[PDB]
Amino acid sequence: MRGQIRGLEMASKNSQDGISLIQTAEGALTETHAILQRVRELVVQAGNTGTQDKATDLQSIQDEISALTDEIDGISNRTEFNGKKLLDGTYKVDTATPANQ
Amino acid sequence: MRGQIRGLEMASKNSQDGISLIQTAEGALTETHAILQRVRELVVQAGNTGTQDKATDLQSIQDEISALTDEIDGISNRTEFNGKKLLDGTYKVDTATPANQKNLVFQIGANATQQISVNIEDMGADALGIKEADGSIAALHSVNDLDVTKFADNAADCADIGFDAQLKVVDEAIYQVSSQRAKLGAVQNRLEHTINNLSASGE
Amino acid sequence: NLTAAESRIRDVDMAKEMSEFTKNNILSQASQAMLAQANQQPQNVLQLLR
């Protein structure tokens, strides 16, 4: 009984640290969203051809968007809970080889 | 954990000072823009030959423009954040020798390789370019700026004294100072979104 | 911008500091409290003594 009591409290703390990790990952996904919204906006106006031309005045927009995608790469790489990268492909759902989930 | 917490707050402050530096650089690029607009205007009217002549009444305009280009040299040289010159060629994007980029590595995270690389360049010779600016064109269209007598010679069909080329290269200078200034706004967005990540993960 | 970064270095976010102050003051009052419990241990030693 003691075994299960103490291990059950520690199981609680385990789940709680799990919550914390997930909150970190999810926050990275929040800033991911905000960026992707910016991207979508830049795409809508960049799709407002007829007025948004010069084509290098799309190059500028492209540069901005490419910087944002670089930030998505950033967030996906630098997101770490106790040093552990999460968002990157380490934790894929299900490959063609389920032995490497 | 403490290591990453404290280092993650300090990583926030690092990014915040990075924002500040970039805001300074960019402000220098604002006044750069205003000057280049003045330049463009002076070129348009100076290209209004037929009425804007005497040719020394272009010399006067030339003198003014040359003063403005001297101011671009000024801003490119005197712009300093904590004494550190930014706009000058110290922070070129990519030379033929990538061993001499000298990027603006900012520390952004509490761990290894969680860093951002930034580059910046402009000075008097910030007109059109391929790897270098060019010779007769493409830098002295932001340093010398023809109209000393050198439009009354020819109009549009000489490629180094014609209005179309000259003004086009002013539009390039505006376009690429605008481009450089447009990167770094996005960099500020990167760092704001970052600090949000740093406050969340920190908590 | 210099003033801004300079303030980020030296000038304090006084909200966070105030929470730190209330916090540490509670740790202090808790500690004096645990003297009020700690010194009360040998008087019971005097109780089995009498």
Added chain:
Amino acid sequence: NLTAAESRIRDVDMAKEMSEFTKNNILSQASQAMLAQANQQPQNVLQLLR
């Protein structure tokens, strides 16, 4: 018309901005407020302590 579109880009509809400013300022004062509630949680921890 260029001035018009240029203004549509950079120049702000200051009414909307002012509503945004009052709004966010209320969020700020609400947040400082919730410090005035949040720091008051462990003093009751000191209350069961004494």
Added chain:
Amino acid sequence: NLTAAESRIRDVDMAKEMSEFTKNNILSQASQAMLAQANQQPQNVLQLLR
């Protein structure tokens, strides 16, 4: 132009000064406040005393 530079020397930008005044006055009221916390430290010393 002399009057202008003379004013740039002596005459104050009273907006900046007013912000400085409100600021420093808050530092003052904060300091008196931290007396209202600081003097309250030894009365708890009297509390473990009794």
Added chain:
Amino acid sequence: INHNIAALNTLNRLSSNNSASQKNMEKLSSGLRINRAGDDAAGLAISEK
């Protein structure tokens, strides 16, 4: 629980909403949404031309 109060989020919402009232301060007191280039680089790149 005492040595680290859990309303650190409150400091972040204060340091974000406070940080946003001031973005409206700079943005209002000049009339410009692209007062600071870090609002939209595209609008700058177009509006300059």
Added chain:
Amino acid sequence: INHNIAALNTLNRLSSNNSASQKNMEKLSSGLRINRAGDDAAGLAISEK
């Protein structure tokens, strides 16, 4: 944050917009855009001749 308020920009937009109403004061009260030579040297150099 308290010892240096972040609305120092406000002082600069005040000391620029205030500085510009007065450029319009000198410029209006004489009718001349080149009242002061520091508006456009070219227009002076031409207009003098």
Added chain:
Amino acid sequence: INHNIAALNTLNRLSSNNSASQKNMEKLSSGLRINRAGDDAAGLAISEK
């Protein structure tokens, strides 16, 4: 056990937490984290320049 009570640690946590409320007293009542140089020498060395 009586001639030396084992809650001497309590005196040290009192003389540290009490010692820290007062570091917050000096640090708050001036607004400055580098009120006293013994908080971070680096921030002083930079901030002075």
